[PDB]
Amino acid sequence: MKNTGDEVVAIISQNGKVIREIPLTGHKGNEQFTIKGKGAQYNLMEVDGERIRIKEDNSPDQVGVKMGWKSKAGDTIVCLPHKVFVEIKSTQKDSKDPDTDLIVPNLEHHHHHH
């Protein structure tokens, strides 16, 4: 029913930096969030019943759409046309290789008004 001890979280990174991470295990019900990156390039992600998938995105690959419901430590969601890379890791000592070679803080080229 709802006794799940394998507490895993989905790590969302884009362009080469971690932008968000959603807990899957125990996270019952439905949840949605839109990953906006470059020119018109976005990924509408959906977490429904302790599992995550790409609900909709504008890519000719649609790889994450083929991936479907992912929810275990080791599952991934990859949309290179949008530079979105997602991997699922567990909270309980799930020691994955932490490659920290990320992209520098991107400047908002319009800082003065919207």
Side-chain angles (χ1 to χ4, degrees):
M1 194 183 191
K2 67 268 183 175
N3 285 89
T4 55
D6 57 295
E7 301 176 70
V8 302
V9 299
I11 314 299
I12 297 74
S13 66
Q14 190 178 31
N15 296 274
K17 60 179 62 176
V18 181
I19 60 178
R20 192 62 55 168
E21 54 181 280
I22 291 70
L24 302 182
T25 311
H27 183 280
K28 54 189 179 63
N30 185 271
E31 182 176 284
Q32 296 181 29
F33 58 100
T34 306
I35 307 174
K36 301 183 182 181
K38 215 83 285 293
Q41 302 295 30
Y42 68 108
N43 287 88
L44 180 60
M45 304 296 294
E46 176 177 69
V47 182
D48 181 77
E50 301 174 287
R51 42 192 156 100
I52 184 176
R53 65 167 180 157
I54 298 185
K55 191 179 186 60
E56 185 77 291
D57 78 305
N58 57 331
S59 68
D61 303 66
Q62 297 289 271
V63 180
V65 180
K66 280 75 176 186
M67 287 295 180
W69 300 113
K70 297 303 186 67
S71 64
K72 291 297 178 177
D75 287 313
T76 57
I77 301 295
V78 184
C79 288
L80 295 182
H82 302 175
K83 296 191 175 185
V84 181
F85 186 92
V86 183
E87 57 155 67
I88 306 177
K89 64 179 180 63
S90 181
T91 66
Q92 52 184 89
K93 296 304 185 66
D94 212 83
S95 300
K96 300 180 71 284
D97 291 83
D99 192 279
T100 315
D101 294 283
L102 48 70
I103 304 301
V104 298
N106 296 147
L107 293 66
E108 66 304 293
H109 47 268
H110 201 242
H111 47 256
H112 197 294
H113 72 95
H114 178 78

